[PDB]
Design a protein around this nucleic acid. Structure first.
Lengths: 60, 77, 63
RNA sequence: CUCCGGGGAGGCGGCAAAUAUCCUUUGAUCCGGAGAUGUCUGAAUGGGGGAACCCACCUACUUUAAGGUAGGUAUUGCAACAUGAAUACAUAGUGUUGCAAGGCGAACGAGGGGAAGUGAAACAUCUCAGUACCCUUAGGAAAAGAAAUCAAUUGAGAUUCC
RNA sequence: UAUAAUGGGUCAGCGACUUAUAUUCAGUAGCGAGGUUAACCGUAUAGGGGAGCCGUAGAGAAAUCGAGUCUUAAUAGGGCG
RNA sequence: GAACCCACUGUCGUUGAAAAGCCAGGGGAUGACUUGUGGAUAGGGGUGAAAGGCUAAUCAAGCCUGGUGAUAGCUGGUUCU
RNA sequence: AUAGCACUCUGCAAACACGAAAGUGGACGUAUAGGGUGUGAUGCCUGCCCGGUGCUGGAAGGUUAAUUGAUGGGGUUAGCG
RNA sequence: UUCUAACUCUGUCCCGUGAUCCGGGACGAGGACCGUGUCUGGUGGGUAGUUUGACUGGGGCGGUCUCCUCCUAAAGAGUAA
RNA sequence: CCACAAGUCGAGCAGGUACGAAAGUAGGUCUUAGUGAUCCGGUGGUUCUGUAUGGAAGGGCCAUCGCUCAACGGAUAAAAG
């Protein structure tokens, strides 16, 4: 499962990295807890275009 | 009933065929299970009885679209 | 209904001008001990015997 | 029982014939069409029940005693509205109104499941046979139907039936 | 089988080699190196309908050839015509 | 040892009074007892202090309808001159 | 069949049983309890055999099912003669 | 070896609710196990369909089942136990 | 010789051989037992076929291999009480 990170994780990435995670990790932990979102075309475009600066300003 | 909501899969009929070509009736059953999915639009957990192929379809399309499609079909969730 | 052919017999018998031709037996697998004269004389086709022509006619109506 | 049209010497249905009353040329009986009435059970639907039974509620008019009359009160699905938890918004739930469905019946269609006797001169592969049977459901028919189809002299042009 | 082997108490009524399709032989009729239509159309036993089938040539597993053809190195010999 | 519940011996009956009985004797009779009403268990199943016992006069697999006109190298029968 | 005796299983969402599942009995019980099996009041007692089959425990030594897919061989495809 | 987020609870509490079903919410004990789908090896009279030859001085037990030589075989061939 | 399936003896022609000076002899051994049909599959050749075309796969033809199918004309590949 390819997911773009909306938060910093110790090993996965930091603030927007696209990373490949095992299916269950995204299905049951990251997506439901909001720490990452599936790297679909629309989601990636929206994150890169509109809310990148807002996510960065939401530092903590 | 053993019916997948996402895909509609249900048990089907076939044959056990032995080494001497004796045939007997059998059923092939789906890999059906209950699963809770988080829905942010409604802020709740939805429990669905579905298969692993349905899980793959959900991974591909997103929970919102699949739930909307089922509701349009007529399922109450 | 229409008469049906006995396909097993149809695969062993063919029709000639006045009768039926056939192949001969005892030439398939055990051959080392058999003499050369038998090997050569059992080759080729022969004619169906008159006594058995009637059964072949019954089993193969359309040939 | 009422009305419209036909008809013109009789008639009051049959087993089942009789007397008696009786109706009829101001037109009967009878024939065709349209209306009125239509108890109880039965999907039965106000609740119950051993079918043709027992019991109950609400509204409105009459009533004076312990009644009558006219209606309404089932479930499920959908829609509108109102109300409304754990829980703060919500949501679940709850309720009113409006609409629709249930059941029965000959064969034919479509779909889900699906034998055995028998034959093979025994019998297990095979046959019987997707037959018998069970279940779901539509119409006057159903289904199929307009090529990611056939053919191969480089041609034919959606389905269906003989 | 007189049999002491089977069946029948008696009478009246009923009671068992059929029908459809395909094929083969015989008789009979039409036509004749030719014979014949099927579904179907048709105010319909008529008329139309020639797609198709049987016959008119065999040999060879087959390619192929053909009053010839198969076998063979062989115009020999032999099998089927 | 009566009622009530059983069925050890013998006679009679065997087209019976009776498709399981009568008569003379016999056993239990405060118990693991007898019995009324209403319920539950359904056929390769049920129940069984156990006999393959009982499951509507039917049980080594109940009854009814359907497959069905099952199959039978067997037995019987098969009509005028 | 019985009171008594003995073997074995079951730590509770128990073992076991019914059912296609849901679930139900065991039991609104908890090893002094529940299921299976054999013997059969009581008295004296109940000898030898673990070679065979079963059960229980251990060993990791030989054999491999799905799965995975090294290497090899073959058909066709390019260019050269 | 730890963890919790899938997942289990025939554990406590709150609500739908007047309810030892069920659903949702909180907690607690477990937890990537158990369990289920597909595939695959082993076990499998628990259940199901079947089979288990003929001759023969009845059947069973015993013997035999194919081929060669002599006699029975009656001076051609053939000829049974 | 023979119900069939099968079995047996053989003059003679063409080719290539061995032994003889030569006429000539030799198509297993003095003869009569030493055996197994069909289906399926393996191997060597093949001027046959090759599902649009060229190939290939597969099929056919000649030679040959795998049954104590001994209940030996051989029910199925596989069967006791």
């Amino acid at each position: 499962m390819d997911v773009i990170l909306l938060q910093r994780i110790k090993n996965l990435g930091k603030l927007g990295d696209k990373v490949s995670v095992k299916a269950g990790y995204g299905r049951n932990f990251l997506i439901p807890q909001g720490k990452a979102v599936a790297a679909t075309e629309a989601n990636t475009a929206a994150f890169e275009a509109r809310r990148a600066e807002l996510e960065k300003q939401e530092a903590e | 009933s053993k019916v997948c909501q996402v895909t509609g899969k249900r048990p089907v009929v076939g044959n056990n065929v032995s080494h001497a070509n004796n045939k007997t009736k059998r059923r092939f059953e789906p890999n059906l299970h209950h699963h809770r999915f988080w829905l942010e639009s409604e802020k709740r957990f939805v429990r669905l009885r579905l298969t692993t192929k349905g899980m793959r379809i959900i991974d591909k399309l997103g929970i919102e679209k699949v739930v909307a499609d089922l509701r349009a079909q007529g399922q109450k969730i | 209904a229409k008469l049906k052919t006995r396909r097993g017999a149809a695969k062993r018998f063919k029709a000639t001008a006045n009768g039926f031709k056939r192949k001969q037996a005892f030439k398939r697998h055990i051959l080392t001990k058999k003499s050369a004269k038998r090997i050569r004389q059992l080759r080729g086709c022969v004619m169906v015997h008159v006594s058995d022509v009637a059964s072949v006619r019954r089993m193969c109506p359309y040939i």
